[PDB]
Amino acid sequence: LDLPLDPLWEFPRDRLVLGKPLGEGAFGQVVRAEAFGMDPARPDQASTVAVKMLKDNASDKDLADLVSEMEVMKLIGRHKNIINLLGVCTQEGPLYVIVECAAKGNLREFLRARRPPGPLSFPVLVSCAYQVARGMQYLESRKCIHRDLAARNVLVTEDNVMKIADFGLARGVHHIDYYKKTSNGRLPVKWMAPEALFDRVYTHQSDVWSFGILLWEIFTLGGSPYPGIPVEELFSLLREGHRMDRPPHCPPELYGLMRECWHAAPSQRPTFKQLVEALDKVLLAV
């Protein structure tokens, strides 16, 4: 190891107390940790953080993936609705990528655990939707494309604030593998815009399509999209302009939003800037 030292981002690893694993990724692993003095004004002050390090039985490509990921994260910048990079540990030990801890975990499982027999009110549901749209609007302003916007990649803090993250996906040979079923049985192709799935074209508008799927997940309280459609059957359905039906207890105002995001033509889909405005109008009204 001979990784460069960026004092701006560098944090002493001895100021980290590692704890509870939060999840195994495809090249890294996220663990919960206590950090001391993340704020140099309060150097003995504890704070809860999440640390990404290399997975067990890791190769040289995995290290390059975690390094490239670290380099991208340094440029993302700070915004209330995107995961915030706090520091890194690159010197005299294993490579650590530190971000803020979102105490309530990923949005999919946050929603799934809070299904009524209720903890989730409709205006809190709109807020989750609005917050994710706000984060995405920031990403697009920084010319950043997500490629895999889903509820499972959005995190929930103790205060129910949404933070866009990116944990997946497995690599194929030369490109990302969207077809591989995740550990949690998720099929990533179900969030893919037609131009991303059929033409390998990724824009902010393809992320808009993905947002429409994420919206469906919020308003089904963590439902899996196209509830019983194998991925082979899904392709014809999409080509032929068929879209998911309005869910059991989803207001038309929000289902209409999903439909705008799923317009076959990327140019006829709204922008994240227009989605923030329409979700703010719904949130204010409710």
144 binds ligand 0LI (CB under 6 A): yes
Number of residues that bind ligand 0LI (CB under 6 A): 26
> Among the options 14, 60, 148, 199, which is catalytic?
148
Instruction: Give catalytic status of residue 44 as yes or no.
Output: no
146 binds ligand 0LI (CB under 6 A): yes
The residue number with the shortest CB distance to ligand 0LI is 165
Residue among 10, 4, 3 nearest 86 (CA): 10
Q: How far is the CB of 253 from ligand 0LI (least distance, A)?
A: 27
Q: Please give the structure tokens belonging to residue 176.
A: 């990302």
Closer to ligand 0LI by CB, 99 or 244: give it. 99
Q: Can you list the alpha helix ranges (DSSP code H) found in the chain? A: 60-76, 107-112, 122-141, 194-199, 204-219, 231-239, 252-261, 272-285
Which residue of 35, 54, 73, 192 would you call a contact of ligand 0LI, by CB under 6 A?
Answer: 73
Distance, in Å, from the CA atom of 96 to the CA atom of 188, rounded to the nearest integer, reads 27
34 binds ligand 0LI (CB under 6 A): no
In the chain, % helix, strand, coil (3-state, to 5) comes to: 40, 15, 45
Q: Please name the residues in contact with 238: beta carbons below 8 A apart, sequence gap of 6 or more.
A: 194, 197
Q: How far is the CB of 80 from ligand 0LI (least distance, A)?
A: 12
193 binds ligand 0LI (CB under 6 A): no
Q: Please give the structure tokens belonging to residue 173.
A: 């040979």
186 binds ligand 0LI (CB under 6 A): no
Which backbone phi and psi does 28 adopt, to 5 degrees?
-120, -175
204 binds ligand 0LI (CB under 6 A): no
Exposure class string for 15-40: b at 16+ Cβ within 10 A, else e: bbeeeeebeebbbbbbbebebeebee
Q: How far is the CB of 132 from ligand 0LI (least distance, A)?
A: 11
72 binds ligand 0LI (CB under 6 A): yes
280 binds ligand 0LI (CB under 6 A): no
22 binds ligand 0LI (CB under 6 A): yes
Q: How far is the CB of 229 from ligand 0LI (least distance, A)?
A: 26
Distance, in Å, from the CA atom of 217 to the CA atom of 112, rounded to the nearest integer, reads 10
Closer to ligand 0LI by CB, 30 or 126: give it. 30
53 binds ligand 0LI (CB under 6 A): no
Closer to ligand 0LI by CB, 35 or 164: give it. 164
DSSP 186-254: --GGGG--HHHHHH----HHHHHHHHHHHHHHHHTTSPPSSTT--HHHHHHHHHTT--PPPPTT--HHH
Q: Please name the residues in contact with 284: beta carbons below 8 A apart, sequence gap of 6 or more.
A: none
Q: How far is the CB of 124 from ligand 0LI (least distance, A)?
A: 20
Choices 8-16, 160-168, 238-246, 257-265 (CB under 6 A): range interacting with ligand 0LI: 160-168
Residue among 71, 84, 221 nearest 164 (CA): 84
**Catalytically active residues, by annotation:** 148
Positions that interact with ligand 0LI (CB under 6 A): 22-23, 30, 50-52, 69, 72-73, 76, 82-83, 97, 99, 101-102, 105, 144-147, 155, 164-167
